[PDB]
Scaffold this active site. Sequence first.
Site, short mmCIF file in Angstrom:
data_model
loop_
_atom_site.label_atom_id
_atom_site.label_comp_id
_atom_site.label_asym_id
_atom_site.label_seq_id
_atom_site.Cartn_x
_atom_site.Cartn_y
_atom_site.Cartn_z
N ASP A 177 -0.19 -7.48 1.74
CA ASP A 177 0.34 -6.12 1.75
C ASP A 177 1.86 -6.12 1.87
O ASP A 177 2.43 -5.82 2.92
CB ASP A 177 -0.29 -5.33 2.90
CG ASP A 177 0.01 -3.84 2.83
OD1 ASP A 177 0.45 -3.35 1.76
OD2 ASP A 177 -0.20 -3.14 3.84
N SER A 215 3.76 2.88 8.24
CA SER A 215 3.43 1.90 7.20
C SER A 215 4.64 1.48 6.39
O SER A 215 5.43 2.33 5.96
CB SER A 215 2.37 2.46 6.24
OG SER A 215 1.11 2.62 6.88
N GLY A 216 4.78 0.18 6.17
CA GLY A 216 5.89 -0.34 5.40
C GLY A 216 7.10 -0.69 6.24
O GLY A 216 7.97 -1.43 5.80
N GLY A 268 2.34 6.79 8.93
CA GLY A 268 3.72 7.15 8.66
C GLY A 268 4.67 6.01 8.96
O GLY A 268 5.82 6.03 8.51
N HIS A 280 0.82 -1.21 0.00
CA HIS A 280 0.00 0.00 0.00
C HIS A 280 0.86 1.27 0.00
O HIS A 280 0.34 2.38 -0.11
CB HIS A 280 -1.02 0.00 1.16
CG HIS A 280 -0.47 0.40 2.50
ND1 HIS A 280 -0.04 -0.52 3.44
CD2 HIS A 280 -0.33 1.62 3.07
CE1 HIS A 280 0.33 0.12 4.53
NE2 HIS A 280 0.17 1.42 4.34
#
Length: 223
Positions: free
Chosen positions: A84, A177-178, A175, A40
């Site tokens: 994801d 995320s990942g 923020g 995402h």
Amino acid sequence: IVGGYTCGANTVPYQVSLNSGYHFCGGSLINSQWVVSAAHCYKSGIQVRLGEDNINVVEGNEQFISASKSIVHPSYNSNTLNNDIMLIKLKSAASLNSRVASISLPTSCASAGTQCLISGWGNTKSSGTSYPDVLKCLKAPILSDSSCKSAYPGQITSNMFCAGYLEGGKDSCQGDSGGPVVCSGKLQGIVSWGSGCAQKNKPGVYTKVCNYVSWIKQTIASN
Ligand SMILES: N=C(N)c1ccc(O)c(/C=N\CC/N=C/c2cc(C(=N)N)ccc2O)c1
Ligand SMILES: [Ca+2]
């Protein structure tokens, strides 16, 4: 990261910041030429920033490298966030050192109760917004599958797991995320989603990396 602490400059050497003119997602260095992040977080024109602590100040140990190719998981579903995960190849190999190091992929999945380290430059406020600039850290245990699915009825798949505290107060946030979820020296999770941040009975949801090791290894070896 909400309810966490300041990691300390370069204490998480595998943590990277994805920049498209500004920090927008985290990622994890798995080898000198590849980074693992959340699908995402996909977007064109990504520059990977390694050796970062304060993302708004050049401190001396950074390496900025443009991405040459991005590979979103073949089965990624943006509506449910199932699968994801995405791989990002660096145009040039990173120079590995004490502040820029890779994190090992798991050879097996982690169990509920295992303590992990979650990190990122995401919002630090449960209600409102405040972005840190320096890397924040959080120790959190993997929650039971049942606790996870009970918190998010019908939304949790076998490719996701929850980590954090049901009481609330500590969790990942916008923020982050990942970013990485490391347990026992292995990258077991990727910051994926959740409901609000650090809310009661609303733990963070993470991509279960152990389910993708075969795909990661094969994909990197063929690209
Ligand atoms: N644990 C939680 N309640 C919490 C809540 C939500 C979640 O995001 C997370 C985990 N993810 C952070 C990444 N967010 C940045 C981000 C940036 C962008 C972007 N630059 N376009 C897009 C999507 C994005 O998600 C955790
Ligand atoms: Ca910096």
